[PDB]
Amino acid sequence: ASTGNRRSHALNSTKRRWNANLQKVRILVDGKPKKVWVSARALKSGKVT
Template sequence: MAKCDICGKGISTGIKLSHSHIRTKRTWSPNVQKVRALVNGAPKKINVCTRCLRSGKVQRAI
């Protein structure tokens, strides 16, 4: 569900390692926001990660 429509960044998986060395699976989700942006000149709601918003890859619709 958490996937950026601009860069394609999605959920990454890994292993949580406790002090007693018990390994369990876990996931990291990107910070994805649903924003109104201009897509081909028309406003549309898209899912965008905050890195794409900060870097100016998305022009927000007002």
């Protein structure tokens, strides 16, 4: 998903995205240590490096 509005003071609307905070890091996927994008929230408590 992750679209929605930007709203003005007179309450106009323009469509707009919210992007995740992807950072490129080297994780240990199956086999090699590989570089990949993953969000900062996801490596808060999800996945080893």
